[PDB]
Point group: D2
Chain length 267, copies 4
């Protein structure tokens, strides 16, 4: 039981192939008691989350919604019972309009689209942290989902910029979480065949974008000194759990790369 | 004449202690023919720029204004004469509301303020590039002003996040500028006593923020193996010119640190 | 039992305050079966290791000795019984002569001293890996001890250069270990009061070096968003175990920072 | 005249396609007065250097030779005349035995070979700096040749480790050079078809190594947002001159990438 009797909030589930779905599964397998947040299609998320090895309360959270955020702590302690706190929080949320990643030239994304992408993808990590730290235990852990934005890449465009912003927000959240005895870190994952990701390689964001994404994926397994399996999200789920646990107690403001080692190799 | 007969657009002048003012001075000293852009207080900027060693046309540019951006190329070629192009472009523009840097806790900046800061500070680098590349010569150079956001720092808060976003935008602008034979790079400067910067250390953004900024400055000269003089912007002006020149012809998507070497030293 | 029934070789124990001593303790607490290697003072190491919560075979290993290395795999399988393999290997060995760190100006270390330091500190990670991979199980883990050498620092001098070399050797060991299903990673620790470290702050390597080391230590806890306790090596021991476990299965060629988050913060 | 009346020592010329040959040519084209150092085949180097646009004294320097180093300052001031100092120093020297790069598995390089490689490739930067700083002017510049070792790469093996060591040595040389008003920096170049480099792609270090090097080269021009021409060393020569000049006066302990921007792009 890596996570025995820890209370952990997990966001961002939308299908059975969401990274957050696998994080939640492995975390329960490891003894965690979960609270889940969902966006928009709540009856759908309910139905999907019913397949986790245990039951967990579902709460609505639109990360762009001030009221959702203001009432969040209240609604969580209500779901976990008064006088209980969280030990962990998982941010697994990402969004960039059409316009900002894919077929569209980089120069043609209007700022409103880019601003929305950054709001949901980078800023919400801070506002989740702000809403949840008052109800977190010493020794607690905040983990967010990242990918390595340190070099530019085709197709991902403004989404990459959003991750650069996220990494930076993470170092600041760490300063705040520290006052609570709480850690803040990101997991940088390699590419994973979620529903949306597979749609994009199928050409949902245009044919040039699809081809480039596919090249990025093939290259990944080659560079990774231990290989990369894009259809298996469990290696990244385990990494997040490692961070939710007591076994990385001196790591914060930081990034753990669950990417097969690909980023450490040129080719 | 490092910049002999180069045509260079320089933005962001607001006083005689603006980094852009010194960039513009040194660039003219080096034979450049300049076009200048100003924001908001145009009669003021006119008056300040009159003190440059040579005269240069002033054009209004509010980086958040679509019409300003759409007409920019037209207005520049008009100022430099039909059939002439630019060889260089300097982005020296930065903004973050009150709310996002200083006394305000990091968690208390509303996204609208952060979004405005990012719009002006990071996104505008791309939209300047988009508006100006059609009128840039092969061998040309785009340079933007940066500071090292790779570690978190007190007081700068959301402005730091904005620079992380900027560095990332720069790597993408480089992909686009490359198609024109144009380079894109950032200069990461150490702290400089501009008017605004001195106001902030005087306590304009609160007393805690002021004290922290001052500590950051004193530390800078100590770490810098060659020292740092915060009241002298000419070392950074020279660095930008180095980048506008033909002497860094294989550098792009990159960051040159005009910071005294401070970032290469722990203490 | 994080490490239940894993067989792990641990090197570098010399006193009850060695990082390797604490790694070994926590690993046994977590169900690991250990084999230990010692250098030079073998009766001493025997006596110290007798205090671990369980017994473990001790083997002599002078990392500079070809015969020691050539016979190592033979001697390990002999200690763990034919047909058994290792699941983990810990490199916790460091050395730099007098000459290369401390009072001595950086320019005054002769290459023979620097070469010895690099041999023991960086190269031996590769030669340990070479000697032990033939007897390692798929899913296995090699972990070495590091400190962040990415910026220069007073006093550590050539030892810092040695760590830069080590980080680089680690990325290459990862390519080799990968063929065996084995991971290779480094843990970058903050400063720890080992016997040798305390001697140096007591002025063993001169008074200027001592003063600088002490300043480095005080700064550490201040920058660390979760604090740093230099007299407690257990947070780093736990981190190494995290890496020896199955919970970071997609991390290799990489560095995990068990440093309180200090490296992610400027001040 | 970028380098008008500067006195610059340039090392590492061996043929008309050496990077140092092109550095020396461009530097003279730019008004520099040069002193040259050569290793081993002195009559050969004499003959090659006769083709530079101006004449320059040749001095023997075996970077591994203590007597050569001890007498170096004496012999330089003798060549440039008493009461004159150097303004610049170029380290353009690299070596790794057979054994440490190429066909040989990474694990099969004996430490003596690796130690020699590191001695010549990394350590000599410090010992050149030590020998020459006493005869350098305030405002002076030390520049060494580098390639980006931050990720592992096939074939280069121990040579990559040597560059990691070099980058680290550079940050320490910067601390020492600073006391003299002198800068220390590295230029990280993309691959260049020197005589030795072409021999290696011809299969001098075995067929697997040759094939991998060739793949590395083709990838380079693709990633570089401005392209890369491996048979043209002048873009890197210009970059070194930029660093020898007064136009990067606040950069030290640092690395300038003359690599086409390749390192800033994933693909
Ligand atoms: N799928 C992947 O391959 C990865 C996901 N991640 C991150 O992990 C997280 C998991 O993403 P996932 O792929 O599972 O799903 P998602 O679609 O990004 O996010 C889940 C939900 O969050 C949802 N969401 C959107 N807006 C909001 C909102 N306002 N509030 C709350 N949730 C929201 C979003 O809305 P939807 O598309 O359904 O309309 C989804 O419902 C995201 O942060 C990803 O950015 C990181 C690396 C990889 C990756 O993209 C990558 C990229 C480049 N190189 C290597 C790896
Ligand atoms: N002053 C400094 O110390 C530095 C400036 N820079 C960058 O260089 C540039 C020069 O800034 P400067 O300090 O000279 O002035 P500024 O106030 O940031 O920008 C100039 C003008 O741009 C203006 N501007 C604002 N909004 C717009 C707009 N919408 N369109 C066009 N211009 C605009 C802005 O508006 P204003 O305050 O007057 O209302 C100013 O008029 C900015 O990018 C800075 O971010 C980078 C490093 C340092 C620095 O902040 C630092 C920080 C931490 N560590 C080390 C160094
Ligand atoms: N003590 C510390 O604070 C740290 C240790 N490490 C690493 O962890 C490891 C643990 O070191 P420790 O401090 O526990 O002991 P050690 O003395 O470095 O090494 C253990 C033994 O290895 C021994 N050893 C030496 N030569 C050999 C040899 N040839 N073969 C096998 N073992 C050898 C060495 O020999 P000895 O001094 O006894 O003569 C020791 O017996 C070493 O790699 C350290 O470099 C990393 C970060 C920190 C650190 O130095 C630091 C520095 C700067 N900033 C932040 C942190
Ligand atoms: N040729 C290249 O493509 C590059 C050279 N450099 C560096 O620039 C410098 C120029 O190297 P060049 O290729 O011109 O020649 P070299 O053979 O490395 O060095 C010149 C001489 O130095 C010489 N030398 C050797 N030992 C000594 C010695 N003991 N004392 C003085 N000089 C010595 C050496 O000896 P030799 O082979 O002739 O026996 C040569 O005579 C070296 O530091 C290179 O490491 C850096 C990046 C690239 C590069 O290798 C690369 C690699 C991977 N990715 C991107 C780029």
């Amino acid at each position: 039981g890596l996570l025995d009797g820890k209370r952990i909030l997990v966001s961002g589930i939308i299908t059975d192939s969401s990274i957050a779905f696998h994080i939640a599964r492995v975390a329960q397998e490891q003894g965690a008691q979960l609270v889940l947040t969902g966006f928009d299609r709540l009856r759908l998320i309910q139905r999907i989350t019913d397949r986790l090895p245990a039951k967990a309360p579902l709460l609505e959270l639109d990360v762009q919604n001030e009221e959702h955020l203001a009432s969040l702590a209240g609604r969580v302690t209500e779901a976990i019972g008064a006088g209980n706190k969280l030990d962990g929080v998982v941010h697994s949320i990402g969004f960039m309009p059409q316009t900002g990643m894919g077929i569209n030239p980089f120069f043609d994304a209007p700022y409103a689209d880019v601003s929305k992408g950054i709001h949901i993808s980078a800023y919400s990590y801070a506002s989740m942290a702000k809403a949840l730290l008052p109800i977190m235990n010493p020794g607690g852990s905040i983990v967010g989902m990242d990918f390595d934005p340190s070099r530019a890449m085709p197709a991902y465009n403004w989404m990459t910029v959003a991750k650069s912003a996220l990494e930076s927000v993470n170092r600041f959240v760490a300063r705040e979480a520290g006052k609570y005895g709480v850690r803040s870190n990101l997991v940088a994952a390699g590419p994973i065949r979620t529903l949306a990701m597979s749609a994009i390689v199928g050409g949902a964001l245009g044919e040039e974008a699809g081809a480039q994404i596919q090249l990025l994926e093939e290259g990944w397994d080659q560079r990774a000194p231990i290989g990369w399996n894009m259809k298996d999200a469990t290696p990244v789920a385990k990494t997040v759990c490692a961070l939710l646990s007591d076994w990385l107690p001196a790591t914060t403001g930081d990034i753990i790369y669950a990417d097969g080692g690909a980023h450490t190799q040129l080719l």
